[PDB]
Design an enzyme around this catalytic site. Structure first.
Site, PDB file in Angstrom:
ATOM      1  N   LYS A   1       5.771  10.519  -5.328  1.00 52.47           N
ATOM      2  CA  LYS A   1       5.045  11.501  -6.150  1.00 52.47           C
ATOM      3  C   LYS A   1       5.968  12.032  -7.245  1.00 52.47           C
ATOM      4  CE  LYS A   1       4.479  13.970  -2.481  1.00 52.47           C
ATOM      5  NZ  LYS A   1       4.140  14.936  -1.425  1.00 52.47           N
TER       6      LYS A   1
ATOM      7  N   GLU B   1       8.888  23.556  -4.538  1.00 49.09           N
ATOM      8  CA  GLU B   1       9.595  22.277  -4.339  1.00 49.09           C
ATOM      9  C   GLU B   1      11.120  22.495  -4.418  1.00 49.09           C
ATOM     10  OE1 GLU B   1       6.799  19.066  -3.113  1.00 49.09           O
ATOM     11  OE2 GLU B   1       8.948  19.447  -3.062  1.00 49.09           O
ATOM     12  N   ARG B   2      11.889  21.404  -4.411  1.00 46.93           N
ATOM     13  CA  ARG B   2      13.341  21.466  -4.282  1.00 46.93           C
ATOM     14  C   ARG B   2      14.011  22.056  -5.521  1.00 46.93           C
ATOM     15  NH1 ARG B   2      11.391  16.936  -2.228  1.00 46.93           N
ATOM     16  NH2 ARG B   2      12.012  16.245  -0.129  1.00 46.93           N
TER      17      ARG B   2
HETATM   18  N1  LIG Z   1       8.640   3.633  -8.386  1.00 47.65           N
HETATM   19  C1  LIG Z   1       9.639   3.684  -7.472  1.00 47.65           C
HETATM   20  N2  LIG Z   1      10.731   2.885  -7.579  1.00 47.65           N
HETATM   21  C2  LIG Z   1      11.738   2.918  -6.676  1.00 47.65           C
HETATM   22  N3  LIG Z   1      11.737   3.740  -5.601  1.00 47.65           N
HETATM   23  C3  LIG Z   1      10.704   4.591  -5.364  1.00 47.65           C
HETATM   24  C4  LIG Z   1       9.575   4.612  -6.312  1.00 47.65           C
HETATM   25  N4  LIG Z   1       8.709   5.530  -5.854  1.00 47.65           N
HETATM   26  C5  LIG Z   1       9.239   6.054  -4.721  1.00 47.65           C
HETATM   27  N5  LIG Z   1      10.429   5.503  -4.428  1.00 47.65           N
HETATM   28  C6  LIG Z   1      11.263   5.864  -3.245  1.00 47.65           C
HETATM   29  O1  LIG Z   1      10.752   7.042  -2.599  1.00 47.65           O
HETATM   30  C7  LIG Z   1      11.793   7.975  -2.288  1.00 47.65           C
HETATM   31  C8  LIG Z   1      11.370   9.437  -2.503  1.00 47.65           C
HETATM   32  O2  LIG Z   1      10.247   9.594  -3.380  1.00 47.65           O
HETATM   33  P1  LIG Z   1       9.798  11.052  -3.925  1.00 47.65           P
HETATM   34  O3  LIG Z   1       8.739  10.858  -4.984  1.00 47.65           O
HETATM   35  O4  LIG Z   1      11.051  11.814  -4.278  1.00 47.65           O
HETATM   36  O5  LIG Z   1       9.142  11.778  -2.634  1.00 47.65           O
HETATM   37  P2  LIG Z   1       7.676  12.471  -2.596  1.00 47.65           P
HETATM   38  O6  LIG Z   1       6.710  11.308  -2.597  1.00 47.65           O
HETATM   39  O7  LIG Z   1       7.675  13.263  -1.310  1.00 47.65           O
HETATM   40  O8  LIG Z   1       7.599  13.333  -3.828  1.00 47.65           O
HETATM   41  C9  LIG Z   1      13.003   7.564  -3.124  1.00 47.65           C
HETATM   42  O9  LIG Z   1      14.199   7.574  -2.338  1.00 47.65           O
HETATM   43  C10 LIG Z   1      12.704   6.171  -3.642  1.00 47.65           C
HETATM   44  O10 LIG Z   1      13.588   5.195  -3.079  1.00 47.65           O
HETATM   45 MG   LIG Z   2       8.498  15.302  -4.082  1.00 43.77          MG
END
Ligand SMILES: Nc1ncnc2c1ncn2[C@@H]1O[C@H](COP(=O)(O)OP(=O)(O)O)[C@@H](O)[C@H]1O
Ligand SMILES: [Mg+2]
Ligand SMILES: Nc1ncnc2c1ncn2[C@@H]1O[C@H](COP(=O)(O)OP(=O)(O)O)[C@@H](O)[C@H]1O
Ligand SMILES: [Mg+2]
Lengths: 31, 521, 481, 162
Positions: free
Chosen positions: C161, C187-188
């Site tokens: 996300k 959020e963080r």
């Molecule tokens: N488009 C992308 N390319 C590479 N890694 C991704 C991608 N989308 C998500 N990830 C992986 O998902 C992890 C965290 O996603 P994040 O968006 O920060 O969490 P959330 O979905 O809870 O917001 C990352 O460590 C990453 O490796």
């Molecule tokens: Mg997030």
């Protein structure tokens, strides 16, 4: 199929017990 | 603690919680402050204020001398938040959340706000757990919050404790500015378990660079609730004074249960799984205080390793799902992998580090970037022999280890598997191959050595590798000699025996040799 | 009226605080400053949520309620919590109240608006059905985001996300004549730094010169009162650029679940009986008054991307389920898709978009996009047959559908430009014309002889044929050796 | 000249006061404590400051009155180089690596010396002299006196050992 359906049915009933115990344990705290 | 004004009398007690009636005048104590209850003329009993009712009554969470608390006793107020002893002098000792030392320094606020947006900076400094599985695939940076989840007896404490033990080999050699000072918080654990960790930390020289926060199962819920907060306070001293720190909470599951007890006993409305409304807020303000500060405020850090016990691999539980949404990814420990053989039982598919690439060392980033591509293809092809299938299986054998590996001894054994030095070597003899690489050396043994600098006995090359990497004109040619000598001699002289030995008392001798090789990396 | 009307703190139970006023209680949503001194480092400001009687009113604390004694002096502000607006806000970081938290002097303001505005009426609504090209294959093809659209990114913990919002800020918010607002809702705090720095490096926020972004953060460290109200603070600033300045604006709420979750904390302490799954009984109403304000008026146009946390990967949960009804393009991220290797982790069958229609987008766009959805639906049915029977048991035509459908799943993956650290490869902005043509040819069967792993983690057709050339050359070398 | 940190706040470039603190060093762990105190007072280490620290690591004994286990002036020294190169983004000049070469020949760790003259010849060129012959002297010293390496490596036992 028999044993998974039974677990679905146990989870259905156990869910609604646990749902309502929490909800009515709330209003015991609220009087 | 420092008394000021007599705020009221004790009315009711219910184990480790109480309510007060105000004294004549109705002074009214401040919220979230410590109060001293006179159990005797000489002795006091501490307590934290949690409810300020309309009546004038004040809800108390009892902390000390709970058996000695009685109804009708006088209650003195501090008018201050809880401060505790903090510093370098507290290291190598066991301490309560209130600050009293357990038999075997300017203060700091336990209730403090976390660093704001401009106060922090991106995490760049690496933090070595000492595991090839973790440090490659799920790399922890200094200031990161990395969760440890899994069932009972999956290695949640051991992987956290060995991460603290892994720092001693670095900390002894390095400048104390960059030393990782550890803070093991023991929330709701059994008392003898804390003693065994104390002895285990003492035998590996960890107590010098570690302080043990302790709120055991005998001690009340008030201390268990407050134990992780007291742990971070001690770490923030090092963070705010430009030094790097580590904080293990073992575990936040038992903290939540202690906070639920407090909330339910004081008639706070419960919600999901009987926990209060703010049980998310409990862990959130704890873990957010762990951070990586900016160059403008010293560039210090508090790294967080919260442990959270799951019941039968159920991540959908309320306390587990809360902590996952706060932390920067997790290290999932599967029960089937534990019993299957892989130890530590790190489920790489379920595990994740949200700031992995930037956190790693320049040398470790080189090898580990390829390993993601190999293990991705190996896992897919295992479900549905290529070069990825051969080399992928050897990585899985290499990830098994009891005690933590040194950065040099890890990265070289992984670099060997990456470029394909363990392809002709069978899967069962990878630990015997790795043992003979680290402790012994075959080039210097037989004859065909002739390397000018690069050997495995010289542990000081560790820090040269971290600077220049293995893929570099300085070390590339010299390293590939060491590995070529080790493989050819191991295949010729050492692996030749395994085609031979097909008899009783030699097959068993081969097993007992190979099983002991799993322990020592 | 009621400007500096004095009251005293009646009761303090957590963030929820009761206040007794001698000359009657102020109105609802009225901000109150706690004047009494205490040992505090930071101030305390209470917002009235309920009235108990004519003289008493229940509130919620925006800061921590530590050191707060009973009978402490409290004074009204004049009305609701007021937040600064206009072009002087651009470049600066703010909190729930509207105080600058970036240490770069006082803000230029010159006007302040209340956080709790009323949502537009039916007459104010207007539909402008134009495609917002995100430069992402799965979005632009299957669930295209429209101009003026409220867009939601539903997914569980650690699915992509925050990664997708950052890629949209790269892909869309940079080359945009409008301004932008980022609601950091619960959020963080550490993620907020990386956004502030990366925007400063790319010069969407500029210190010396022109800025085109506003940051309003109410993060996990803050108490529930702030995290609840901080979504509205950012929305007030975007409403100024919409209504007064008359402009196309972007809004970025990460995460909208944290609004609902923050209200779930106070609602328990306020003494309301919880509804299904322990949420507040006003869950649909809380989202109602917030989400209805986020809309394209006749005066201007908000185009809001939102992140939505799906707790325990349970999409039937009230917090996402209630949100789904409000959105124009619903983006659903699945964990099994992420763990299989496909990033972004968009499960296209659970997704939907309003503008997926022959009238809005072109006929060639709709027909190709539907065939991808149709082929993937057949593929999921065939996937159950191969597990039972086998790959060899399938028909001659069905085998060719599997070869194409396997390539469709792989080609839907895309290496993001913000995620160079994760993927270890440079990003790819794929054009709308490239996206439609490349997928069209794959359905025809023009790329049947092209290998499967060529399509995995690339942009358009030129990058597919480039990787296929590299695969042919390296396979030729290893075969020769 | 003027300078700014990653956010864009003003930064104290006044290095010279903190340099003289590092000169009054005595034991080399005190140098790190000073390096902390500069960063705390928004004053990042200069290229000259790292070299002034590197000097103190060479001259003094280790921690303080008591010795620590596995001291290694080289490991403490090479950590500080890793800090300035990668994190702080500063290329170490010719003075930086000359302090490293001195410690190899002084302590007697010649094997490191072979690796770092290769580094000094390739990276920062300078003048590869004085210490090269002193390093080569220690290499021949190990050969003629007894043997090079330890005895656990030489052994030639093999088979089912440990
Ligand atoms: N488009 C992308 N390319 C590479 N890694 C991704 C991608 N989308 C998500 N990830 C992986 O998902 C992890 C965290 O996603 P994040 O968006 O920060 O969490 P959330 O979905 O809870 O917001 C990352 O460590 C990453 O490796
Ligand atoms: Mg997030
Ligand atoms: N990597 C490992 N290899 C072998 N045994 C291990 C390993 N990690 C943990 N153990 C053993 O498993 C048991 C449980 O470990 P512990 O860390 O306490 O798990 P938990 O915290 O889940 O209870 C301990 O007796 C410990 O010695
Ligand atoms: Mg344990």
């Amino acid at each position: 199929q028999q044993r998974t359906s039974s677990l679905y049915n146990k989870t259905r009933q156990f869910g609604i017990t646990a749902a309502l115990i929490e909800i009515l344990s709330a209003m015991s705290s609220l009087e | 603690f420092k008394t000021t004004e007599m705020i009221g009398y004790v009315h009711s007690i219910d184990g480790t919680i109480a309510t007060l009636i105000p004294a004549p005048g109705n002074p009214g104590v401040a919220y979230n402050t410590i109060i001293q209850i006179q159990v005797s003329p000489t002795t006091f009993a501490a307590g934290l204020v949690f409810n300020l009712e309309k009546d004038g009554r004040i809800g108390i969470i009892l902390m000390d001398n709970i058996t000695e608390v009685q109804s009708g006793q006088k209650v003195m107020a501090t008018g201050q938040l809880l401060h505790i002893p903090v510093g370098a002098g507290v290291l190598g000792k066991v301490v309560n959340p209130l600050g009293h030392e357990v038999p075997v320094s300017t203060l700091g606020k336990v209730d403090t706000g976390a660093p704001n947006i401009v106060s922090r900076s991106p995490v760049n400094y690496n933090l070595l757990t000492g595991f090839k599985a973790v440090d490659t695939m799920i790399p922890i940076g200094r200031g990161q919050r990395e969760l440890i989840v899994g069932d009972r007896q999956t290695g949640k404490t051991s992987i956290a404790v060995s991460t603290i033990i892994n720092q001693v080999r670095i900390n002894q050699q390095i400048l104390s500015k960059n030393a990782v000072i550890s803070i093991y918080v023991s929330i709701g654990q059994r008392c003898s378990n804390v003693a065994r960790i104390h002895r285990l930390l003492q035998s590996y020289g960890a107590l010098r660079y570690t302080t043990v926060m302790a709120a055991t199962a005998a001690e009340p819920a008030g201390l268990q609730y407050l134990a992780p907060y007291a742990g971070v306070t001690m770490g923030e001293y090092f963070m705010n004074r430009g030094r790097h720190c580590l904080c293990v909470y073992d575990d936040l599951s038992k903290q939540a249960v202690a906070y639920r007890q407090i909330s339910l006993l004081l008639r706070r409305p419960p919600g999901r799984e009987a926990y209060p409304g703010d049980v998310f807020y409990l862990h959130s303000r704890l873990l957010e205080r762990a951070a990586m500060l900016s160059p403008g405020k010293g560039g210090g850090s508090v790294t967080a390793l919260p442990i959270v016990e799951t019941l039968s691999n159920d991540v959908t539980a309320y306390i587990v799902t809360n902590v996952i949404s706060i932390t920067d990814g997790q290290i999932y420990l599967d029960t089937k992998l534990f019993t299957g053989g892989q130890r530590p039982a790190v489920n790489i598919g379920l595990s994740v580090s949200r700031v992995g690439s930037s956190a790693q060392n320049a040398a470790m980033k080189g090898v580990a970037g390829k390993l993601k591509g190999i293990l991705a293809e190996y896992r897919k092809l295992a479900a549905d022999q290529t070069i990825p299938m051969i080399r992928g299986a050897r990585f899985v054998a290499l990830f098994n280890q009891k005690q933590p590996s040194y950065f040099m001894n890890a990265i070289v054994s992984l670099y060997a598997c990456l470029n394909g030095y363990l392809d002709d070597v069978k899967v069962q003899y990878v630990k015997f191959y790795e043992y003979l690489l680290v402790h012994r050396d075959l080039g210097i043994m037989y004859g065909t050595a002739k390397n000018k600098f690069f050997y495995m006995y010289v542990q000081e090359l560790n820090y040269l590798i971290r600077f220049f990497t293995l893929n570099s004109p300085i070390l590339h040619g010299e390293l590939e000699e060491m590995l070529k000598q080790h493989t050819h001699l191991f295949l010729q002289h050492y692996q030749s025996k395994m085609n031979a030995i097909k008899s009783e008392k030699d097959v068993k001798a081969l097993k007992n040799l190979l099983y002991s090789c799993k322990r020592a990396v | 009226d009621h400007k500096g009307r004095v009251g005293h703190v009646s009761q303090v139970i957590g963030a929820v605080v009761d206040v007794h006023f001698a000359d009657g209680v102020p109105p609802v949503l009225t901000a109150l400053d706690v004047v009494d001194k205490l040992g505090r480092d930071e101030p305390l400001t209470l917002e009235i949520v309920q009235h108990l009687d004519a003289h008493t009113g229940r509130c919620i604390a925006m800061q921590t309620t530590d050191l707060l004694k009973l009978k402490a002096k409290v004074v009204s502000t004049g009305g609701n919590i007021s937040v600064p607006v206009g072009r002087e806000t651009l470049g600066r970081i703010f909190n729930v109240l509207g105080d600058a938290i970036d240490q770069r002097g006082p803000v230029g303001e010159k006007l302040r608006m209340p956080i709790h505005a009323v949502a537009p009426k039916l007459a104010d609504q207007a539909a402008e059905d134009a495609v917002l090209t995100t430069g992402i294959k799965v979005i632009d093809l299957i669930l295209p985001y429209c101009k003026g659209g409220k867009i939601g990114l539903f997914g569980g913990a650690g699915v992509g996300k925050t990664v997708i919002i950052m890629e949209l800020i790269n892909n869309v918010a940079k080359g945009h004549g409008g301004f932008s607002v980022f609601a950091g809702v619960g959020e963080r705090t550490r993620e907020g730094t990386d956004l502030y720095l990366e925007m400063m490096q790319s010069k969407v926020i500029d210190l010396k010169g022109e800025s085109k972004c506003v940051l309003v953060y109410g993060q996990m460290n803050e108490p529930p009162g702030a995290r609840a109200r901080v979504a509205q603070s950012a929305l007030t600033m975007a409403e100024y650029f919409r209504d007064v300045e008359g402009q196309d604006v972007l809004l970025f709420i990460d995460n909208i679940f944290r609004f609902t979750q923050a209200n779930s904390e106070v609602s328990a302490l306020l003494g309301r009986i919880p509804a299904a799954v322990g949420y507040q009984p006003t869950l649909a109403e809380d989202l109602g008054q917030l989400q209805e304000r986020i809309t394209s008026t006749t005066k201007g146009s908000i185009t809001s991307v939102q992140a939505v946390y799906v707790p325990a990967d349970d999409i039937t949960d009230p917090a996402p389920a209630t949100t789904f009804s409000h959105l124009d393009a619903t983006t659903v991220l699945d964990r099994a898709v992420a763990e299989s290797g496909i990033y972004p982790a968009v499960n296209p069958l659970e997704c939907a978009s309003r503008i997926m229609d022959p009238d809005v987008i072109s006929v060639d766009h709709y027909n190709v996009a539907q065939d991808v959805v149709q082929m993937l639906t057949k593929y999921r049915e065939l996937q159950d047959i191969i597990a039972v029977l086998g790959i060899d048991e399938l028909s001659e035509e069905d085998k060719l559908i599997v070869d194409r459908a396997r390539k469709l799943v792989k080609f839907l993956s895309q290496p993001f430009q913000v995620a160079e650290v994760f993927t270890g490869m440079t990003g790819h902005y794929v054009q709308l014309d490239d996206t439609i043509d490349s997928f069209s040819g794959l359905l025809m069967g023009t790329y049947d002889q092209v290998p499967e792993m060529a399509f995995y983690m690339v942009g358009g057709i030129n990058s597919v044929l480039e990787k296929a050339k590299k695969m042919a050359e390296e396979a030729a070398e290893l075969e020769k050796m | 000249a003027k300078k700014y940190d990653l956010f864009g706040y003003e930064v104290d470039t006044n290095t010279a006061p903190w340099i003289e603190k590092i000169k009054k060093c005595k034991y080399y762990d005190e140098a790190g404590e000073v390096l902390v105190n500069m960063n705390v007072s928004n004053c990042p280490p200069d290229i000259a400051t790292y070299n002034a620290t590197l000097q103190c690591i060479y001259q003094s004994p280790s921690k303080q009155s008591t010795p620590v286990d596995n001291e290694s002036k080289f490991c403490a020294m090479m950590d500080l180089l890793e800090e300035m190169q990668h994190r702080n983004r500063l290329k170490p000049n010719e003075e930086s690596w000359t302090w490293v070469m001195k410690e190899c020949v002084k302590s007697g760790q010649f094997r490191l010396g072979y690796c770092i003259q290769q580094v000094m010849e390739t990276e920062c060129k300078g003048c590869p002299a004085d210490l090269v012959k002193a390093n080569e002297a220690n290499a021949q010293k190990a050969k003629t006196e007894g043997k090079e390496h330890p005895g656990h490596l030489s052994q030639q036992a093999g088979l089912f050992d440990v």
